[PDB]
Design a protein around this ligand. Structure first.
Ligand SMILES: Nc1ncnc2c1ncn2[C@@H]1O[C@H](COP(=O)(O)OP(=O)(O)OP(=O)(O)O)[C@@H](O)[C@H]1O
Ligand SMILES: Nc1ncnc2c1ncn2[C@@H]1O[C@H](COP(=O)(O)OP(=O)(O)OP(=O)(O)O)[C@@H](O)[C@H]1O
Lengths: 170, 884, 884, 45
């Protein structure tokens, strides 16, 4: 009874690789929502498998932007198709947890990859050429890219990919 | 944003792919998409879950195999899934042969591995309480045989009611076998439900017993057989002694007496017979306790207690005990009252004359300081050469060989009179119920049963095998193989015999070599409970017997940490402790962490304790866990830690019996009897407030033992609908009392059953609803239910458990000293096993604190899953209660 | 063992030794041993403490100096000492210029440095609660002047009792100056303690006021002077308005009227005079509030509230307000009731005609949706050219220039009548007490005082300087410098004027440039309190005024974490919120850590909040601390966090005033009045159960405002000895009622004062002890004391505080974004300053949560050091209570 | 204790000397039933 995917975790031994990966996604629209380091005040929810540093990045979902004419700001859940649930309701839902292991011990990276959805395929392609590399695709995948981690990019389970502001029903 | 969502996970397989296809489909609930292009795994409709699998040689078989084994150490990049109720998936993986990683095993994130390793699962984005979990007819005949045994009336009451409830006519065979042989309406009377009213309190046998000379011959056995077929009795239930049941067994084999002198012979072709032991002796071999044994033991100890309750030199006292065949009463009384010398048939003097043996033991005791010498003489008191030893024989040795003024106390019929003790009432009742079921469940291919108790649990044992075994013991005594006779008796008897002689023997050189001698400490944690002092007495005397150094930690963990309350235990100072109520050491509810855990650890190393015995309730339970978990910090705590549960409540997991619960049960049972008697004197109910806290154990058992109509328990609570139903029950009960016995009515309400509907509130509602037809009064005795003088059962059980505790510490100390003398202690499985809870389960077993704390307890403010569910059902059956 | 003990520590010095000798002797309590061998430091006798100091060159000056500076970074081998009460040594070191290291600053181990660094100190061996800490006569004359002002009777009551208590004759000068000029027994009557009974409730002035034409001239001023010397009045207390006090001030300077026409001239040589402002106007310059101002403001708002409590297009309503010189009543009513347009003398239309100004503002409001237009017209309503603007003038503009059917409401005498509001009763009383003390403490070299309130605190200000300043304001208005006149008024007036025009102005372009515009959120945490909705209304309207985006977090932290309750605030939707009771947003007691702190943090970043305003009690206080402490984990929380205390209790440290306490005080005061009135009708006492929890603030103030004989508070508790003493007081009180006014008797008991001695128990004890001479009845209103419609004070204070909160977030947001956009956040001092509590202290100040949580609060189950100690002393004085 | 932080910490104790108990078997430590033991509010002398 798995709803969807919660997050992807990337573990590294090299701090230099860790920080360069953080800055890579930072340039790509990610925001660090939670941070950890070796102080007894720090809250622990994730830390195995332990970790010396951990940065939780979030590329926030897309909601129906509010007009006020001044400059555009995010709405609330007073939005178009928001249906309140027992917990939170029902908006293009992606978070990636970056973990850093000690000096020593640690497994080697296996061959698998993750494919994320983008409603701005060309805008992403342009930032990647402005930053890193753009791998050619195989199979829904539009293209692919890399850092110590190789990743794929396409459109979600829906038919197509950027109308954030939705059409209200009749 | 630009990373707008998460479309799918892409996995590359070596060349084979199918093993993973089977895993993600059976374990995760995925499905292969229709018409595959080469040779997509989606979960379900209206979703967005997808995993892509490709057979391209991009992932190696050698690398993947090495990575799987590498993970078998309890780091790599992974993928987490949002999934409700992770607990169900974790069990499905573990049982499917897949290892998993989780937070408190309660649980937060779950993580397993496939050919595609590290497949995580979270129960939510960030920290918070998780995502909600999605979507047969036969007429019975009862009889009693042999000498009066307390609990015979409770048994008959049970048989009459159980049989009635199961829809069958119950006949009470008056004057046992005599009544069975003579027959007729004169001796075989049909009994009604209301005819056995308040028989719980009644002593002896209301039916009656008689020795039938004719039934000893085939002459009478045939006459009895006719009378059963004439009365239409399809089944017989005998409640009596050894021969009383052997004669029933002979009657069973001799039943094929077809005697031509066919309608009746066709119907009444087989004898449905069931036995229950109604004896004070405890001589029957296939049961641990016979009905009346503990009440008789109680009468004896009541006398010994009175004897000990005085001053004086040159004084000896003889307690002449009833019990012709067995020495159980002598041995247990001797143990419960710490008697100097016991004369029982299983253990006569062997290497020297009984007079020399007695005088030596008595002498040693007086020499060390003990001024009140108590000698117990069994009815079956015998010498090697089977010569019976009389009381006068024993008296003259004490008066002439020693200079002691001897005063003999003889119980006689006292040992058969009085009401049955809580244990006898509870057990005789359940045995009565079982006897009916056994008799109904019986089929011609099933051997005739005898109802037996085996470590606080009702069982069925073949009567032939039990009759044969008792004879084997008598044969061993008569053939002068006493050592053999002792082993032939139940395992509890052999342990008690060992326990007694060891505790009776500080005044003889230690039984262990210098190297094997240890420093064992004892504490009392929680509220006082009967047997706390007995557990201390038995442990100290057993330690001296082995050559150990017994230490007592006065006033719990607070006394140790704040005051260095480590005190030595002197044999003369602990004189009479086994019979004293409360805690002489001092007990409190202070936890090791509420006292200084570092200071407890410091004193443990300062005094170099090789083990610890905790005697107490739930606080002592938490204490064990707190001491066990601190082992990583303190090597001083890396020693065997044993808990002997002691609470009147019985809220501690690990045991089915907590020390002091029988003392408490019996005091409350005596209180309830007086209250019901008072109700019987005036159309009145009593709402009796019960102790035990959040544990409904005492009210359950008191309801059964007293004949209470209802018992309101904390596990169930009190609903208005049940209260209205129960009040209407009372309304009807009193409307139907017109004609029957006025036995009185009780409602037992555990204080914790309702905070709103209190004893006082409940009673006012009864009066309101009663509309003058009857009244209600409360009975609130208070937190006095503890009781003084502990029950002989509590004194005895505490001795047994204290010794098993010392013996466990002996066994595990060697293993512990490895973790003690070493740093780099990673808290293994070999060490966690040493922090244990001693308990009764169906079997006497030590259970590691870890499994009972994490899984078997309401660790929180509740301090408590119950076992007594069946007892509850039966007590509602016997009182006509209708639940919802 | 072999290392059996610790003899002494040996320290080596470079060549000089003396600096350390002075340190260990002054700071540690050591002493130099008698007759030194070369050129030993022992502590005391019957001990074993010793430190050896040698001057041998074994330790270098360069190395030691470098090590001392190296330690100034908050590892090295050290020595620890066993020392009781470490707190005292830590203060002695820190203040002596020595740095120290400790555990919770409460504290466990203390560590400092000498020339011999790292000298540790522990308060015990291992973890446990620490080692216990070792070892003048003059006769007064009162008068009232000017128009009726609620609170004049409470003031006179105070002066009569205070003066009596201080041992001096009090005379009440009837008909003010007229009575003073006419003199005699007819107007100057001696007043007794019982003569001012129940005057708290009484409206207007029982003494009376009269405009004396003669006193305006030297003719009368002389006659008045004679009458005082004839009556033997050594001191005068005037309670009145502006001119009423200016005339008293002129009488003060003109006092040297020796006039020969010497015994009396020698004694009555100096005029002891004291002033108190008895005006509804609030025109006097050196005080923040005049006596009667808030009651008058209350009458006005009561009318506006009734006007708003209806439907309708083409409707306008005019509220004609009494108040000739000042615009304070108009401005505050306008603010409290969110009026469209106010016509006050300090702010007449300047750049355009008042009709054009009014029509524009009114028009804009109607256009945006507001259907009920309320226009407030001051008595002093004026134009630029000082032409007075009438109600009819205003009516015709609304009826003819706009199509509105205008209905005028004129308060008239309503604005002077009725009982004084809780604030007026409390303040007038304390002012009366102070006026007496001031008059007694007065000496010829001391300038005549006027009693003034300065931000909820009673002060003394020179009457001449206050008279001069009020004239300066009048001069500014008359000289047409309104901007100047506004600045000349008290700082609260200037802030309220700014607050009103900004909240009145969404319908005009934002006051901040695009870059400086932020996203501010608001939450309500705890139980509801009057002003919660006003704080929300004012914050949202002020945000729109600046160009910020106001967000409302519905139903506290639980609503955010479990349901994403971030909601936008629309101006039309919040119509009338400033006047609504409770919390429209939704409030609860759920803490950020009891809700998901990670989820709160997630939504803070999802919506990108630039600041947070918490409106609530102690749970909102803990909430601040919990959000502040989570900043290390979540960059999203590294923004200014501001708490505006809102509790009826006033238990939150940081403020002396919590929002809703005046609303609550007033509702309970109204309840107690009815109960006392009922007691007055029947020899009866009422024990009135008071709310506020563990905070005794409300019962303290209710005792003063209602004239309760006793108030039982949680900080003091209720002793049996005090209860017996207080009951005997009641016994005597009723025995002495024979002859005096029957005003009734109250005892106020905070529920938390005693768990055993409850309202109901206390009252039954009174009846038992009373022996039929009087009876006792309880009054338990319940947790209803919250109150609906918040007090004008609460509506006004909430506006002021909400704006100060937004303004703080504006100031601190730039600094925060440094910590927000950066990882490696080490939790500095620059950031901890942003998590603050807005409060009143003597001064309106923001206090960092860290200092109030760690040091100023009972963080635990108590949720609460008090300031109201003096108020308590005075209320016991005024009621004749004797403590123990 | 863990500042000044620390990766490992071992707390060693050379226990005080008390009045040894005879029982003839081998010598063991007494209790605070010892000679000059005077019980205090906390631990004694
Ligand atoms: N009947 C008894 N009652 C009480 N204690 C006994 C009894 N028999 C033995 N003991 C305990 O055992 C200790 C040893 O007893 P004993 O020296 O006579 O050896 P034994 O093996 O039990 O005797 P025997 O070989 O004659 O049967 C006694 O001093 C006593 O403390
Ligand atoms: N008497 C008033 N009553 C209510 N709001 C007022 C009043 N005077 C000004 N305002 C508010 O201030 C806003 C701007 O006022 P305005 O357009 O008249 O400029 P101003 O500086 O107040 O006027 P002036 O220069 O004529 O004194 C109004 O739209 C309204 O919010």
């Amino acid at each position: 009874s798995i709803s969807d995917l919660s997050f992807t975790s990337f573990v590294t031994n090299d701090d230099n690789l860790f920080e360069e990966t953080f800055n890579f996604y930072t340039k790509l629209g990610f925001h660090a929502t939670r941070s950890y380091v070796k102080n007894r005040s720090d809250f622990e929810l994730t830390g195995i498998s332990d970790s010396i540093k951990e940065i939780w990045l979030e590329s926030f979902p897309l909601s129906e932007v509010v007009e006020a004419g001044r400059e555009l700001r995010k709405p609330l859940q007073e939005s178009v198709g928001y249906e309140s649930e027992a917990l939170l309701g029902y908006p293009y839902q992606g978070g990636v947890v970056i973990k850093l292991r000690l000096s020593n011990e640690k497994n080697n990276d296996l061959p698998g990859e993750v494919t994320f959805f983008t409603a701005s395929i060309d805008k992403l392609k342009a930032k990647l050429i402005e930053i890193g590399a753009e791998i050619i695709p195989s199979k829904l995948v539009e293209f692919s890219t890399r850092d110590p981690m190789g990743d794929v990019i396409s459109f979600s389970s829906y038919p197509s990919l950027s109308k954030k502001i939705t059409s209200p029903d009749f | 944003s630009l990373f707008n969502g998460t479309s799918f996970i892409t996995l590359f397989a070596p060349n084979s792919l199918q093993a993973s296809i089977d895993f993600y489909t059976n374990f995760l609930g995925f499905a292969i998409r229709k018409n595959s292009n080469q040779k997509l795994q989606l979960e379900e409709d209206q979703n967005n879950v997808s995993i892509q699998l490709i057979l391209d040689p991009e992932h190696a078989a050698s690398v993947s195999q090495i990575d799987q084994n590498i993970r078998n150490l309890t780091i790599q990049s992974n993928i987490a899934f949002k999934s409700s109720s992770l607990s169900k998936l974790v069990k499905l993986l573990k049982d499917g042969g897949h290892p998993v990683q989780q937070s408190p095993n309660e649980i937060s994130p779950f993580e397993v591995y496939t050919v595609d390793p590290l497949g995580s699962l979270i129960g939510f984005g960030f920290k918070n309480p998780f995502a909600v979990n999605e979507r047969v007819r036969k007429t019975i005949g009862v009889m009693t045989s042999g000498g009066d045994s307390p609990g015979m009336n409770p048994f008959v009451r049970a048989v009459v009611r159980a049989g009635i409830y199961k829809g069958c006519k119950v006949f009470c065979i008056h004057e046992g076998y005599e009544g069975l042989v003579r027959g007729g309406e004169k001796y075989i009377k049909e009994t009604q439900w209301h005819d056995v009213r308040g028989w719980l309190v009644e002593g002896g046998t209301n039916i009656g017993t008689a020795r039938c000379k004719e039934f000893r011959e085939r002459s009478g056995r045939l006459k009895a057989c006719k009378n059963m077929i004439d009365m239409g009795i399809d089944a017989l239930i005998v409640c009596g002694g050894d021969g009383s049941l052997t004669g029933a067994d002979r009657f069973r084999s001799e039943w094929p007496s077809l005697i031509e002198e066919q309608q009746q012979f066709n119907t009444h072709q087989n004898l449905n017979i069931c036995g229950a032991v109604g004896s004070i002796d405890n001589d029957m071999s296939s049961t641990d306790a016979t009905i009346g044994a503990f009440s008789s033991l109680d009468r004896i100890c009541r006398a010994i207690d009175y004897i000990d309750a005085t001053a004086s030199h040159s004084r000896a006292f003889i307690v002449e005990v009833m019990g012709r065949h067995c020495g159980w009463l002598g041995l247990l009384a001797g143990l419960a009252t710490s008697a100097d010398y016991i004369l029982i048939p299983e253990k006569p003097a062997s290497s020297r004359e009984w007079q020399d043996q007695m005088c030596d033991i008595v002498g040693k005791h007086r020499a060390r300081g003990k001024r009140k010498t108590i000698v117990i003489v069994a009815e079956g008191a015998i010498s090697n050469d089977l010569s019976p030893i009389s009381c006068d024989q024993v008296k003259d040795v004490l008066v002439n060989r020693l200079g002691l003024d001897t005063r003999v106390t003889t119980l006689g019929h006292v040992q058969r009179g009085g009401t049955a003790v809580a244990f006898d009432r509870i057990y005789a009742t359940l045995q009565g119920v079982e006897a009916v079921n056994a008799v109904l469940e019986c089929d011609a291919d099933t051997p005739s049963p005898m109802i037996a108790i085996k470590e606080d649990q009702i069982t069925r044992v073949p009567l032939v095998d039990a009759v044969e075994l008792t004879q084997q013991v008598a044969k061993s005594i008569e053939s002068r193989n006493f050592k053999k006779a002792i082993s032939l008796r139940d395992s509890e008897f052999v342990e008690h015999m060992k326990n007694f002689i060891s505790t009776n023997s500080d005044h003889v050189p230690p039984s262990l070599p210098l190297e094997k001698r240890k420093k064992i400490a004892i504490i009392n944690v929680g509220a006082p409970a009967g047997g706390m002092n007995s557990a201390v007495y038995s442990m100290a005397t057993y330690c001296m017997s082995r050559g150990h150094v017994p230490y007592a930690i006065h006033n719990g963990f607070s006394g140790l940490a704040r005051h260095e309350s480590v005190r030595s235990i002197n044999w003369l100072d602990i004189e009479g402790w086994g019979s004293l109520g409360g805690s002489e050491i001092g007990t409190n509810r202070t936890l090791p962490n509420d006292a200084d855990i570092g200071m407890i650890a410091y004193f443990f190393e300062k005094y170099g304790f090789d083990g610890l015995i905790l005697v107490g309730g739930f606080e002592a339970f938490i204490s064990l866990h707190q001491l066990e978990r601190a082992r990583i910090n303190y090597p001083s705590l890396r020693i065997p830690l044993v808990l002997i549960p002691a609470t009147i409540s019985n809220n501690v997991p690990g045991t089915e019996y907590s020390l002091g619960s029988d003392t408490c049960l019996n005091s409350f049972m005596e209180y309830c009897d007086v209250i019901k008697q008072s109700a019987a004197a005036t159309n009145r109910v009593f709402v009796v407030e019960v102790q035990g806290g959040n544990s409904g154990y005492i009210a359950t058992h008191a309801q059964l033992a007293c004949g209470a109509q209802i018992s309101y328990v904390p596990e169930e609570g009190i609903s208005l609908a049940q209260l209205e139903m129960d009040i209407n029950s009372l309304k009807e009960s009193f409307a139907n009392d017109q004609g029957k016995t006025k036995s009185g009515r009780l409602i037992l309400k555990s204080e914790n059953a309702s905070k709103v509907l209190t004893t006082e509130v409940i009673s006012t509602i009864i009066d309101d609803e009663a509309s003058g037809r009857f009244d209600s009064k409360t009975a609130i005795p208070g937190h006095v239910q503890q009781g003084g003088i502990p029950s002989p059962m509590d004194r005895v059980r505490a001795s047994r458990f204290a010794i098993r505790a010392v013996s466990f510490i002996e066994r595990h100390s060697d293993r512990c000293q490895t973790f003690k003398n070493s740093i780099s202690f990673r808290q293994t499985d070999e060490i966690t096993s040493t922090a244990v809870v001693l308990g009764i389960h169906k079997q006497l077993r030590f259970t590691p604190i870890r499994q009972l704390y994490d899984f078997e307890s309401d660790v929180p403010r509740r301090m408590r899953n119950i076992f007594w569910s069946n007892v509850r059902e039966i007590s509602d059956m016997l009182s006509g209660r209708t639940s919802l």
